[PDB]
Design a protein around this nucleic acid. Structure first.
Lengths: 121, 65, 54, 171, 459
RNA sequence: UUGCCGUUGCUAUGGC
C-alpha cells in the first residue's frame, strides 16, 4: 500500500548494510540511482537497495519497475543516512547495487541476504 | 625505537637474583645486542651492568620481535 | 534532446546539470497519481543557483 | 598425501587440469594432499552417520567435527550437520587457501600474481608474514590479510630496483 | 643544598598548607595517591548544580570544527613541580582546536568567567602537498588534507594532530611551530583518534587501516602496532595505566588492549531486539560503535549509532547496563517533502507510520577520569550529564545543558580551585557537520564554535 | 564572540 515496499525490519537492515560495506571494500558496489539503472540495464545486478526516506520517494520509484521486469531482488532500508555511511562515501546515498561476480570473496554472504530479500517480496 | 619488556618475573633469593623472560621489540632493526640489552635492563632495574646476564635469544620469523 | 538542443565548456556543464534535474522531475511526474509542481519549483530554483555560480 | 586409485583416467586428468588452472596449483601433489584430507574427513563423517542418533559418540565427535569445519570456513554456519559434511568437495578446500583469498580480496590481479606476492614475503596475516601459499585461512584471519609492514607495497622504503634506478636518474 | 633538602622544604611547606586548610590530613594524603589504585575515587556527582551552570557559545570562523583538546597543569606530589612548561605558563589553562579547514588554533581558558581567547594558530594548505607521492616521503611540515584529531601533551610541551593526510605532525605548544612529522606509512592509514597515556609521553593513535599505533613523543619514534580490529578504529581512550580501549564501529566490538601483557579483551554488545521485544511482552538494532571513554581502569562506556550508551566491566564480556535511545529520536521528515503528491493523505502514507524514525547518534562521550560522572553529546541540541551508581552497576541522567546546538564533535572538561571546592568547565567543539563526513542533514541553528559551560557544586 | 551578511545592546544571537 505504501510506495516504498517491502521495507526491511531492524534485524535485516543491519545485515544488508553489512554486506554493502563489504562490497564497497571489494569494489563490488555501484552507488546512486543513475548507476543502479545502468546495472539493471546491463543485467549485472545481484540486487538493488533503496532508501525509503528518499525525499521525495518517487525519485527512485523507477528502479522497482526495472527490478520486477528483469527479475532482480530489491529491498528498502529506512535510512539514507545510514546507507550512505555503510557505502563508505561521504554523502547520503539513496540507491545502491551489488554487481554480479561469481569469483567474489563475499559470495556466500551475498546469497544469504538474497534469499531473505526474496522471502520478503 | 627498541622496547624491552619483562614478563614472568620470579624473585629467586636462593641464588639472590631475579629471573624473567625478556621481549625485545625492534622494528626496522636487525636485532639488539646482548650487551646493549644489558645496559637497558640495568637502567630499568637500577642494577650494575655487570650483574645483568641475558641468553637464549631467538628472533621470530620475519623479524620485528 | 541533444539533436534539437532542448536542454541548452561552461555552457556544457549547465546542460548536463540541467539534464539530470529533468530526469528527476520526470520520475516524480510519471509514478505520481496526482503530481504537483512543488518539487519542480525547488528543483528549478536549485538549477538557477548553479547558474549564477558559473 | 595418497595416490588416487586410477590416476590415468581421462576424466581425472581433465579434472586436475581444471583445478590447477582455476587455482594456479604447481603440481597434482597439492590436489592429492587436499583430496586425502577430505577423504579422511568424509570417512569419519560416514562412520559417525552409521551410528545411532543420540549416541554419545555420534554427538560428541560429530559436533566437534562440525565446529572445526565451520572454524576453517568450509562449512557455512547454516549447514551445521554431518550430512553436509559428506557434501564437501575439493574446491571448497582449495578456495580457503591463502593464494586464492589474496586473489579474491583484490590484492593481486591473478592467482599467479598472488603466489609471487606471497612467496616474496609481501603478505601478512595479522602480525605474521606468511610466505606459504598453501596456508589455510580461517574466518577471523580472512579480514586480517594485508600487505606486510616491511613490504614496499605496505609502506616501507622502495625495493632494490626502485632506489637503484632513482640513484641512476639522479646522477 | 641537596635536592633531598629541596624536596623536604617543598614537602614541609605543603603540609603546612594542608594544616592551614583544616585525621583530616591523613585522609587527604591518602586521596592524593588514589590515582595509583585504578578505582573511581571522585564521588561528587550529586554535588553538581546542573541548573545554575553558566553557559556560553563562542563562534569561530572556521568551517566544521572537528576536535578539541584541553591541557590542565597538575602539581606532581612526588616532586612538587607543576606540569606547566614554563614559569610564564604557570597555572594557565590552554585549549587546542582543529577543523576541516586545515587550521590548528590554541586558546587560553584560564578564566572561567571569561570566554576563550585565541592566542596563536597555524594553517595548512596546498603548499604542503607531497610531490613524491610515496608514503615514506609524506614528510611535509604542514597539512594538506582535513585535520581530524588533536591532543595536548600532559607536560604541556607538545600538541600533535592527525587527519586524512595520513601524517602525524607534532607541534610545539608555545609557538605552534612544526618540530617533527611521523608518516603512518600506509596507503589508507588515516588517523582517526589520538590519546595520551595519562601523565606520560606515550601516544595511542587509531588509524583507518584497522590498526592502532603507539608512539613515544619524547623520542619522536613509533613503538608498536596493534592488530585485531575488523573495521576502522574510530575512537580510542587511555588512562595512566597502559590499558587503552578502542571501538571498531561497524564491527560492533570494543577491544581493551593490555599493552603490558600483550593481550586484548573482546567485548560485544550482542543486544538483539527479538529478545528485547519478547521480554517487553520501538527498538533499533545497533549499527556501529563510535565513541569510547575509560571511566576507570576496570570500566568504560561506549556510544553507538543507535543512541545506546553502554556501561562495560572488564570481568563481563556483555554489557552490564545499557541506556537505549539516550538522546531521543529524530523528528519525522516533512510530509510535504516525502513525496510530490498533491493530496495530503497520500503523502502521509509515505511516512509509513513510525517505521522510518531513527534515534540520534552519540557523536561524543567523555567521562571525567576516576569519577562517577560522564557527559554525552549529539546534535539533539543539548549536552546530557550522567551519574554512575556507587556500585558501578547502573547510571542515571543527572541533567542537561541546552546551550549547545549542532553536531558535538568532541567534549572536554577542566577543573580549578582547591581540592574540596572545585569549579568544572565543560568545553565542547560544535560543528555544522559530523567530523568524519557530511552525511548528517543540516541542523537548524547549528553554528561552528566552542560551547562552554561552567558548573560549581554546593551542598 | 563572527570568514561573510544581519539583528540586538552599550551585550546577546539569526542566515550563508
Amino acid at each position: 500500500n505504501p510506495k516504498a515496499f517491502p521495507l526491511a525490519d531492524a534485524a535485516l537492515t543491519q545485515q544488508i548494510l553489512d554486506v554493502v560495506q563489504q562490497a564497497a571494500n571489494l569494489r563490488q558496489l555501484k552507488k546512486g540511482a543513475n548507476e543502479a539503472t545502468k546495472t539493471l540495464n546491463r543485467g549485472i545486478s545481484e540486487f538493488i537497495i533503496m532508501a525509503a526516506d528518499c525525499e521525495p520517494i518517487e525519485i527512485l520509484l523507477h528502479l522497482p519497475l526495472l527490478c520486477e521486469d528483469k527479475n532482480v531482488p530489491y529491498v528498502f532500508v529506512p535510512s539514507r543516512v545510514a546507507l550512505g555511511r555503510a557505502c563508505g562515501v561521504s554523502r547520503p546515498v539513496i540507491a545502491a547495487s551489488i554487481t554480479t561476480n561469481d569469483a567474489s570473496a563475499i559470495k556466500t554472504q551475498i546469497y544469504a541476504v538474497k534469499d531473505k530479500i526474496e522471502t520478503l517480496l | 625505537a627498541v622496547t624491552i619488556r619483562t614478563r614472568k618475573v620470579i624473585s629467586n633469593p636462593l641464588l639472590a637474583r631475579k629471573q624473567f623472560v625478556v621481549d625485545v621489540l625492534h622494528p626496522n632493526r636487525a636485532n639488539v645486542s646482548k650487551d646493549e640489552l644489558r645496559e637497558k635492563l640495568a637502567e630499568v632495574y637500577k642494577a650494575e651492568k655487570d650483574a645483568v646476564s641475558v641468553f637464549g635469544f631467538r628472533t621470530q620469523f620475519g623479524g620485528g620481535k | 534532446g541533444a539533436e534539437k538542443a532542448l536542454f541548452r565548456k561552461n555552457k556544457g556543464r549547465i546542460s548536463r546539470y540541467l539534464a539530470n534535474k529533468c530526469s528527476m522531475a520526470s520520475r516524480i511526474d510519471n509514478y505520481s497519481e496526482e503530481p504537483s509542481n512543488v518539487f519542480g519549483s525547488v528543483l528549478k530554483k536549485q538549477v538557477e543557483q548553479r547558474l549564477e555560480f558559473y | 598425501y595418497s595416490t588416487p586409485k586410477r590416476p590415468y583416467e581421462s576424466s581425472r586428468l581433465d579434472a586436475e587440469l581444471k583445478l590447477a588452472g582455476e587455482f594456479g596449483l604447481k603440481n597434482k601433489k597439492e590436489i592429492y594432499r587436499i583430496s586425502f584430507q577430505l577423504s579422511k574427513i568424509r570417512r569419519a563423517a560416514r562412520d559417525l552417520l552409521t551410528r545411532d542418533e543420540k549416541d554419545p559418540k555420534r554427538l560428541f565427535e560429530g559436533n566437534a567435527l562440525i565446529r572445526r569445519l565451520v572454524r576453517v570456513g568450509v562449512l557455512s554456519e547454516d549447514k551445521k550437520k554431518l550430512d553436509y559434511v559428506l557434501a564437501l568437495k575439493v574446491e571448497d578446500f582449495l578456495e580457503r587457501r591463502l593464494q586464492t583469498q589474496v586473489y579474491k580480496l583484490g590484492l593481486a590481479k591473478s592467482v599467479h600474481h598472488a603466489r609471487v606476492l606471497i612467496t616474496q614475503r609481501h603478505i601478512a596475516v595479522g602480525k605474521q608474514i606468511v610466505n606459504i601459499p598453501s596456508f589455510m585461512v580461517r574466518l577471523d584471519s580472512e579480514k586480517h590479510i594485508d600487505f606486510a609492514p616491511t613490504s614496499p607495497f605496505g609502506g616501507a622504503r622502495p625495493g632494490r630496483v626502485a632506489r637503484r634506478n632513482a640513484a641512476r636518474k639522479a646522477e | 643544598e641537596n635536592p633531598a633538602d629541596k624536596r623536604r622544604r617543598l614537602a614541609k611547606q605543603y603540609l603546612e598548607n594542608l594544616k592551614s586548610e583544616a585525621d583530616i590530613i591523613a585522609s587527604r594524603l591518602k586521596e592524593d595517591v588514589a590515582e595509583q589504585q585504578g578505582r573511581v575515587f571522585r564521588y561528587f556527582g550529586d554535588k553538581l548544580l546542573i541548573s545554575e551552570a553558566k553557559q556560553s557559545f563562542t563562534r569561530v570562523g572556521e568551517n566544521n570544527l572537528t576536535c578539541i583538546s584541553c591541557f590542565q597543569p597538575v602539581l606532581n606530589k612526588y616532586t612538587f613541580e607543576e606540569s606547566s612548561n614554563g614559569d610564564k605558563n604557570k597555572g594557565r589553562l590552554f585549549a587546542y582546536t582543529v577543523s576541516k579547514d586545515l587550521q590548528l588554533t590554541k586558546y587560553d581558558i584560564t578564566d572561567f568567567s571569561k570566554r576563550p581567547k585565541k592566542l596563536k594558530y597555524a594553517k595548512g594548505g596546498a603548499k604542503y602537498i607531497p610531490t613524491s607521492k610515496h608514503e615514506y616521503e609524506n614528510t611535509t611540515e604542514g597539512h594538506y588534507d582535513e585535520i581530524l584529531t588533536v591532543a595536548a601533551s600532559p607536560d604541556g610541551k607538545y600538541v600533535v594532530t592527525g587527519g586524512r593526510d595520513r601524517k602525524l605532525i607534532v607541534w610545539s605548544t608555545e609557538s605552534l611551530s612544526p618540530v617533527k612529522v611521523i608518516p603512518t606509512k600506509d596507503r589508507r592509514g588515516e588517523v582517526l583518534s589520538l590519546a595520551f597515556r595519562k601523565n606520560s609521553d606515550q601516544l595511542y593513535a587509531s588509524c583507518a587501516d584497522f590498526k592502532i599505533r603507539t608512539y613515544s613523543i619524547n623520542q619522536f619514534s613509533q613503538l608498536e602496532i596493534l592488530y585485531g580490529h575488523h573495521d576502522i578504529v574510530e575512537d580510542i581512550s587511555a588512562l595512566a595505566m597502559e590499558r587503552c580501549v578502542t571501538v571498531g564501529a561497524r564491527d560492533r566490538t570494543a577491544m581493551l588492549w593490555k599493552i603490558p601483557d600483550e593481550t586484548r579483551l573482546t567485548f560485544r554488545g550482542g543486544d538483539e531486539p527479538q529478545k528485547l521485544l519478547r521480554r517487553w511482552m520501538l527498538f533499533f538494532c545497533e549499527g556501529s560503535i563510535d565513541v569510547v571513554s575509560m571511566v576507570d581502569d576496570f570500566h568504560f562506556i561506549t556510544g553507538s549509532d543507535n543512541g545506546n550508551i553502554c556501561l562495560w566491566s572488564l570481568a563481563k564480556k556483555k554489557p552490564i547496563f545499557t541506556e537505549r535511545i539516550a538522546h531521543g529520536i529524530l523528528p519525522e521528515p516533512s510530509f510535504n517533502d516525502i513525496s510530490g503528491e498533491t493530496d495530503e493523505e497520500l503523502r502521509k502514507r509515505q511516512l509509513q507510520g513510525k517505521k522510518l524514525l531513527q534515534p540520534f547518534w552519540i557523536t561524543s562521550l567523555y567521562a571525567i577520569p576516576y569519577s562517577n560522572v560522564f557527559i554525552s553529546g549529539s546534535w539533539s541540541g543539548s549536552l546530557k550529564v550522567w551519574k554512575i551508581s556507587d556500585n558501578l552497576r547502573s547510571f542515571e541522567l543527572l541533567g542537561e545543558l541546552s546551550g549547545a546546538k549542532g553536531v558535538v564533535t568532541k567534549i572536554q572538561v577542566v577543573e580549578s580551585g582547591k581540592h574540596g571546592k572545585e569549579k568544572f568547565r565543560i568545553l565542547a567543539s560544535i560543528a555544522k557537520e559530523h567530523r568524519l563526513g557530511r552525511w548528517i542533514a543540516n541542523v537548524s541553528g547549528a553554528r561552528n564554535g566552542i560551547y562552554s559551560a561552567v558548573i560549581d557544586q554546593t551542598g
